[PDB]
Symmetry: C3
Subunit: 254 residues, 3 copies
Amino acid sequence: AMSTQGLVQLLANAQCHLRTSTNYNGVHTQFNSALNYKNNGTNTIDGSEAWCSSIVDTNQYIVAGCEVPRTFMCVALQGRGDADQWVTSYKIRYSLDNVSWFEYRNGAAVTGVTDRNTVVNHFFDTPIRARSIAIHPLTWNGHISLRCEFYTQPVQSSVTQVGADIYTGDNCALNTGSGKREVVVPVKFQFEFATLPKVALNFDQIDCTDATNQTRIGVQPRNITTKGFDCVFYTWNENKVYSLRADYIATALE
Amino acid sequence: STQGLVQLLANAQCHLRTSTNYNGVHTQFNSALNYKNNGTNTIDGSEAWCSSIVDTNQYIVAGCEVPRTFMCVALQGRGDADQWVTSYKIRYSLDNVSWFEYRNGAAVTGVTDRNTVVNHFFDTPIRARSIAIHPLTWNGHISLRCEFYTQPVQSSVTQVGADIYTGDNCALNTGSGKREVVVPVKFQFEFATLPKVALNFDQIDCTDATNQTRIGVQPRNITTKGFDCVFYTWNENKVYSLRADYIATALE
Amino acid sequence: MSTQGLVQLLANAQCHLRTSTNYNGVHTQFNSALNYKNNGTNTIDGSEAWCSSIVDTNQYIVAGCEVPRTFMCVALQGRGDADQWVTSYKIRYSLDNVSWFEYRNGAAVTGVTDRNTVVNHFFDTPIRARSIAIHPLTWNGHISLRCEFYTQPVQSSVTQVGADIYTGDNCALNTGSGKREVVVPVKFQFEFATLPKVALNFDQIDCTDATNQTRIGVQPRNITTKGFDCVFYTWNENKVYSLRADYIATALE
Ligand SMILES: *[C@@]1(O[C@H]2[C@@H](O)[C@@H](CO)O[C@@H](O)[C@@H]2NC(C)=O)O[C@H](CO)[C@H](O)[C@H](O)[C@H]1O
Ligand SMILES: *[C@@]1(O[C@H]2[C@@H](O)[C@@H](CO)O[C@@H](O)[C@@H]2NC(C)=O)O[C@H](CO)[C@H](O)[C@H](O)[C@H]1O
Ligand SMILES: *[C@@]1(O[C@H]2[C@@H](O)[C@@H](CO)O[C@@H](O)[C@@H]2NC(C)=O)O[C@H](CO)[C@H](O)[C@H](O)[C@H]1O
Ligand SMILES: [Ca+2]
Ligand SMILES: [Ca+2]
Ligand SMILES: [Ca+2]
């Protein structure tokens, strides 16, 4: 437990779809596959403390599929809780683009378990960047029966909106006067962010007069909310600015 | 009351993991709100997810890889027998490492019959990836149908491209009037939908014209594959070079 | 080869599968993947298909993806172990998971005529959606199928914006001549999973021309997953009092 501290337990957190090659029956399915899964020991009808295949050969597998790429640090294997069935060695295969698949260690066997309940962790030689990952049992005791977990680095999710060409107008109010002067253009995002975004807001067109050879121009967001922000174009000192244009990039996390 | 919200289970937007299943026809396959099955055949099981162990340690977990704002959870009893959950607690996780309890684990009111849906709108919407219903009290058995209602999500894909350049002493450095130098840009991969493009200066080398600076950069002919980076000046200005970075984002 | 280069969604476990009904617990969506085959010597593992419990025109299997996909093709296949198959169906889909639509306004699409011969349907126009559903309309024997959806590959990006990286007032660019720089180290709020690309552009400029010439620049150097150095610079005889920039850093896959 300490050895995978701070990592995401994929199956525990229901972060992946699980597809199996075959299921012994309807109470031996991938619904029973989570590490340390335990069921009703007094009632036989809820089935096995494991996913168990129907066909017993070297062509079986369980696939965990994530739509968002992850960095897989480790796979834990465990035997069947309620009978002497466990997987003693297996192959790992994975895919990042879900078109081409690859074999970990070129398909060499990874060491599995030797009993019902003692978990055996395997940390991948190099962390594997993938969307989908599969356990392919190669050798077994009794039957192809397992519980398992995959451990990944935490993911971060961003949502970004770009908006183009926020403009002061021609011969705008920055083109007269002196001292600090601002022209404000309210901007509404196309959709409302779920959390407060950070906003980059940068020049794409500049039409301005120097003042004793000095250029002084700026643009900055103000009053950023989930819905929009005020685009503040500005100059200062004696500078006269005919126009300014900017594009923005707004990004919220998680 | 849930108009405009995404019905997660109905839309197959989440994986469902349960603590235990009574048997193979009482599983989370049967868990969607208003799920109804063959009333003339017993073999397809319950109009509910039903646990195998009946205690206060059961749960159904719904997992989303894309974070959601959970507005409401709806509970419903079992359609075909007098089994329902009378109260429950809610637990959730945003990062799938640390979990939290809604209301510090206090009970939320469930249902009182087979079919009448009881909506619970969270005191404050919950930002999370995974969410779990933990039954605390029940009538007859731990048996339920449910739904989670979230705000619609948006998905963006962004490509950054660096250092699109006019070249030194470019064509904008001679002549009068509106003048343009066009640099075609191809995105590293083709977007699925039409992107919007921010394209902004990172290097400027230009001459003033009667003290005026006039410079611009703008995309033209944006497609899913790329765009034309148009560097320009106008009037009498002479521009030796311009450089820009772009940010292209496509939605949905 | 017609689907060369496309993602096989179910085979890659890229979707959740919900069904209207399942005949029993060994005829579920666990058995729905194109070319799914099971133990032909043991009855207990059920059908080489998803099979409904109710036989009417109201059944369906829904495939849901959280990340939007461009659906190119749906492949239908009958039941491997009995003479049951879906001869026509409609396709429904949703992009936002609030409003649903029907392909061809709900007209039938041609299904299969036997147990095993796959019939591909390439959509008239590719469908942009999160969730998609096969709704059997006519069948032989029973509503029993295997299927696949084929999507364009997806790309996933993560972006961080940081604002207002600044030289300071009256910075080192404001004296001297030749190539001169001011370096401001930047640390990303979180570490990216893969190496980002960085856009870094001006939002505030305070500078003196040199014989009517403006010369200013800003560029990232030493980009890592953790951050970068923001290099503000000028050259020739220009004196630059200050420069400010915002950054956008994006990592792929
Ligand atoms: C500061 O304004 C000063 C600089 O622009 C300086 C450049 O040589 O010119 C002084 O005359 C300017 N002072 C005034 C009062 O106009 O500019 C920096 C940005 O570079 C900050 O914005 C300061 O707030 C402002 O005083
Ligand atoms: C417009 O061009 C005018 C401005 O640059 C103005 C600044 O004082 O100088 C006038 O000579 C310029 N007119 C011409 C014909 O060069 O600039 C704006 C952008 O600021 C638009 O591009 C207008 O279309 C253009 O006329
Ligand atoms: C190049 O520098 C030249 C330009 O700034 C030019 C503008 O008229 O003026 C020359 O005096 C400059 N040469 C020197 C040695 O300062 O500018 C480009 C970017 O535009 C590159 O940085 C070149 O490396 C540089 O020589
Ligand atoms: Ca622009
Ligand atoms: Ca750059
Ligand atoms: Ca800024």
